[PDB]
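User: Need the bound-state model for 6FE:
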Amino acid sequence: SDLGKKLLEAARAGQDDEVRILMANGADVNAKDSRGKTPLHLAADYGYLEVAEVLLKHGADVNAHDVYGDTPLHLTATWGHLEIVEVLLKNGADANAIDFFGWTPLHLAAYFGHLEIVEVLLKYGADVNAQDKFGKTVFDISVYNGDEDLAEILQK
Amino acid sequence: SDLGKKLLEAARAGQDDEVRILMANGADVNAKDSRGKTPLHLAADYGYLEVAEVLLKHGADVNAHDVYGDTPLHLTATWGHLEIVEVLLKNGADANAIDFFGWTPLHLAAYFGHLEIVEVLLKYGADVNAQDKFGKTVFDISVYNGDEDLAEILQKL
Ligand SMILES: COc1ccc(C(=C2C=CC(N(C)C)C=C2)c2ccc(N(C)C)cc2)cc1
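Assistant: Bound-state model below.
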């Protein structure tokens, strides 16, 4: 409630010290804002690595979905935060999580050309044959984007 | 600075009364957050029409860009806020502004199937032949998305 609101603002601001103080006083680690985003969503969205590690250590749901079905891994794969992608997958983030558009984090990472995240997601079991609600796979994204370096990864 | 931070949080929360108080207090209408978004960006992002009109009445930059080159019109075209799209265009928003991906607001509206915003942008001079940095037009989006209704709007031009 009130502590959950201050935790969402502290996570959005990248204040890891403020997040630690809120955790010791029983703040809801999985409080949701107006779009269903948890503090881990915001730390993953803005690239706050040290904030995400504090949240995950205190029981943050690594596979929490917002109102659009996006997980914290969906947001990191969009903005290209390689270090947080690694921390999420180490804490049990589902590489095949799916939002309301049918997108896996592999879809969003392939759309925005974050190939280093694509290979890490493949290492953790991301399915290349997964189709979104528009019948698109990662192969179709490489053709649409003309990304030869992505198609060269999928060929292996 | 201090007042601009509170204006950004007030616009993100949709408190048009709190915004008007900070406006009269001398807050910077074009204050930016860590991603370069103005209060008009946030009001356009979350669909707060009354907040966006208050900002525009007090000299908000209708064509402000964030760190990724997105204008408030780019955000409304993404989230399908039709009422704010018309308000921005009535206040002089560039209907053909591009971001770092070369996307016009017509590209983002066509990607997310916001056909009402597509036609409104066309009424304000949006170029259908505009290509992004990947050589994509709204015709390529209609074929890629398989949007029957979008391709029907484009062929009637
Ligand atoms: C704000 O977060 C996002 C998320 C996705 C996109 C985007 C798409 C792609 C496919 C879409 N549909 C509904 C088929 C809808 C939206 C997209 C389209 C093209 C590219 N390229 C070619 C780099 C990247 C992303 C845009 C922004």
